[PDB]
Amino acid sequence: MEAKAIARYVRISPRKVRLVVDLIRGKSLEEARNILRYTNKRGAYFVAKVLESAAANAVNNHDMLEDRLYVKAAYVDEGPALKRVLPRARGRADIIKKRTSHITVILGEKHG
Amino acid sequence: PRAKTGVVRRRKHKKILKLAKGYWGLRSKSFRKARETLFAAGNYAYAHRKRRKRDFRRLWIVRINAACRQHGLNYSTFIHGLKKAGIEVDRKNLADLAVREPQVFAELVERAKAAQG
Amino acid sequence: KTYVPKQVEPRWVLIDAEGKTLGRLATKIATLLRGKHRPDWTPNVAMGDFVVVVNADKIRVTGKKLEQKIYTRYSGYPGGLKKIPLEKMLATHPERVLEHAVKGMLPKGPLGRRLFKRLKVYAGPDHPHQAQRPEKL
Amino acid sequence: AKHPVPKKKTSKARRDARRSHHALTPPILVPCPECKAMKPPHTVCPECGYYA
Amino acid sequence: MFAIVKTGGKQYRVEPGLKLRVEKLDAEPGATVELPVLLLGGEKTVVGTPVVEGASVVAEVLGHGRGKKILVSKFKAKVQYRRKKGHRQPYTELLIKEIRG
RNA sequence: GGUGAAAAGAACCCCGGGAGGGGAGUGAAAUAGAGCCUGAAACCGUGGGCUUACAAGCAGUCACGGCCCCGCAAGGGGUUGU
RNA sequence: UCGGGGCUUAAGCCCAGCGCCGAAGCUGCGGGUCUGGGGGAUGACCCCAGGCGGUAGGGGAGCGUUCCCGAUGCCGAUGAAG
Known part of the structure; x- marks a missing residue:
């Protein structure tokens, strides 16, 4: 079988966590x-x-x-x-995007 | 009675994005950047069917010219006979007879030749 | 639906040069560089006879070309236009004059560069006695 | 805003292209003698210790 | 044998029996049409004068059918000129049987 | 402005400080789970097929080839090397 | 740098011929639509010949969207709209 687990609404930038994630694929x-x-x-x-x-x-x-x-x-x-x-400066007001991520993982038994 | 857009615009949009499958980048995701490419395509395909015709008149011809050159005559002088001897047979497309059945190309040669001069 | 040929075996050709006018020998070398002579012809697959030339350093060229002909090569930096005539060409690496002649008469693009590794010019004569060598005139 | 600015939106393909060497090389570790646990090389780490 | 019959504006080589799609004819759905229009042969027959004075190639009409809709899209820029045109060229199915000379 | 027929608004267990998930359960429907009916496009990602590191470009388009794909067959698609 | 290569009794010039390549022109074949003509009592429909690049612009014929009559009707959980 396969086993999920998703951490949604996580207050950290997606591009930023997107590395750490791939740093652990199929490992x-x-x-x-x-x-x-x-x-x-x-x-x-x-x-x-x-x-x-x-x-x-x-x-x-x-x-x-x-x-x-x-x-x-x-x-x-x-x-x-x-x-x-x-x-x-000079009254210009930039909107800024504090983003967030929906980090998901799924695992599977070794072999067979 | 007010008439909203609703289904209409989208439908006619995505009705075009389909024609856009395969196009690089925004060419094939952006409606607006797709249409142009298609406007180009339309014309391309159209002017290219008028091209495909010659695109073959040439290939055929070259092979003809090389082929009968190994027999001892120019392409020009090749047709000269095919028309002198009268044999309007060899339509340049079925002039591939320089490959298959070359002994059937040869009897065409000796036709051009001894019938010409 | 026109014939569209399959796999072929190359036919390397032994070509002299002694006495042979440049371009005249240039053309044929190139027409053969593709297969415009083989009605098994195909303008994209590339199957020209591997042209091989010996004693290239022995090519007659018209008028006053030797002292007159001027090959121009430009780098990137200013005044980088290096001007080099035949006279200097022959005496150094002669095989190269008959190279740029033929390369400069071949289809300009990808398979064209294919139709260059086919070109085997030398000075001697003598060349890779290899396996094929059909001497053409 | 002032003087230099992009003349073109960066094609995604070129953005994701510039990313090329973004990836981060995972930390280098080795088992230690003291415990069966993982350590970085040349570093004193918990669940273990050393000798003088 | 190689029979080089001309039909519907073009010229097609043919074998002793063969599937081929030619130009739309005016033939019964499943009848038989000779193409007395035939050049050359499989055993040497240069058509001295254009077509052979005495030969033929017999073909059955396997049934007609439309074509596959192609799209001619005229467009001239700078000035709103868009032309959207469908066009399926019709045809008939000619099953080759005899090549009797 | 909108869950749902009805809060029946997810007991308890599990990871986690929380947020948040995973099972169990409610429900005809939970990819109707709570700004929640429908869920479009841009836009961001993950897996797969094709493809690219001598190649020059309004990116498409004719032509053929290779690969991959539905199909007895003929054929159709996807890609794209020249 | 004559487009480039390359070209010298020429791949230059002049003069005289023969052949061939060569556009979307012309022809072959099929089809679109329209104006004109014949048959058809027949409408239908058949055939013959000719026209059909196009901005401003004029003219004809359609498609789709909203709502109304048709509606106390018909389709709709065996599934409406999207």
């Missing part, structure tokens, strides 16, 4: 925990906590083995913008 779950654990990016804190929950539902609701699941696929969609107004 030994246990290796991923590793990979991000020493990865230098704020994005790590997220793709990891969604990773942890990803394996969770893999073992808790989908009687899969933790000692052998990998990051089947994992993508980060772009959730709704969060615009804030920004003063600026």
Whole structure:
């Protein structure tokens, strides 16, 4: 079987987390925990906590083995913008886009 | 009685995006940037069917010219006979007879020749 | 529906040069560089006889060309127009004069550059005695 | 705004093209003697320690 | 044998039996039409004077049918001139049988 | 301005500080889960087929070839090398 | 740098011929629509010949959108609109 887990409405820029994510495609779950654990990016804190929950539902609701699941696929969609107004020389006011992400992971038993 | 757009504009838009499958970048996603490309296509295809005709008159001819050259005569002098001897047979398309059945091209040659001069 | 040929085997051709007028030898070299002589003809697949030329350093050329003919090569920097006549060409690497002649008469584009690796000019004579060598006149 | 500005929207294909070397090379680690745990090379890390 | 019959404006070579689509004729849906219009042969017959004085190629009409709608789109720029035209060229199916000389 | 016939608005368990998800459950429908009916386009992504690192361009278009794809067959599509 | 290569009893010039390439012109074949003519009592429809690049612009014929009569009707959970 396959096991999802999506962290939606996550208040961090999508392009930004989009790296950390691909930094752990189809990788030994246990290796991923590793990979991000020493990865230098704020994005790590997220793709990891969604990773942890990803394996969770893999073992808790989908009687899969933790000692052998990998990051089947994992993508980060772009959730709704969060615009804030920004003063600026001579009265010009730039809208600015605090974006957000919908980080998703899915794992699968090793082999067969 | 007010008449909104509604279905109409979209329909006629996406009715065109289809014709736009394959076009590079915004050419094939942007309605507006697609139409132009099609306007171009229309003309291209049209002026290119008038092209395909010659595009073959040529190929055919070349092979003809090379072919009968290995027999000892120019393309010009080749037709000269085909018309002198009278044989309007070899339509340049079915002049591929320089490949298949070359011994059937040869009897055409000796026709042009000894019938010409 | 016209014939559209398949796979072919190349036919390398042994060509002299001693006495042969430049362009005259240039043309034929190129017409053969494609297959305009083979009615198995196809203007895109590329199947011209691998032209091979020996004693290229021995090419007669008309009028006063030797002292007169001027090959122009331009770099990128200013005054980078290096002007080089035949006289200098022959005495150095002679095989190259009959090169630019033929390359400059070949279809200009992708397969054209294909129709250049086919060209095997030398000075000696002598050349890669290899496997094929059909001597043409 | 002032003087220099883009003359053309950047073609997606060219944007995603400029990204070429964005990807980040994952941290380099090695097992350690003390524990079966992962460490970076030349670094003292928890669940372990060292010797003097 | 190679029979080079001309029909419907063009000239097509043919085998002893063959599927070929030619120009629309005025033939019964499933009748038989000789193309006495035939040049050359499979055993050497240069058409001395244009067509052979005594030969033929027999073909059946396997049934007509339309064409595949092509689109002629005239457009001249700078001035609103758009021409959208459909056009399916009709045809008939000529199944080749005999080539009797 | 809009869930739904009805809040029946998701007990409890699981990861998580939370947000948020995964199962279970409600419901005919949950890709009707709460700014939630319908969900279009731009725009952003993930997997796959084709394709590109000697190639010069209003990007299309004729022509053929390779590959991949539905099809007894003939054929049709997708791509695009020249 | 004559478009380029390259060209010298010429791939130049002049004079004299023969052949061929060569447009969307002309011909072949099929089809579109229109004006004109014949047959058709017949409408229908058949055939013959000719016209059909096009801005401003004039003229003819259609398509689609909203609403009304048709509506106390017909289609619609076996699924309406989108």
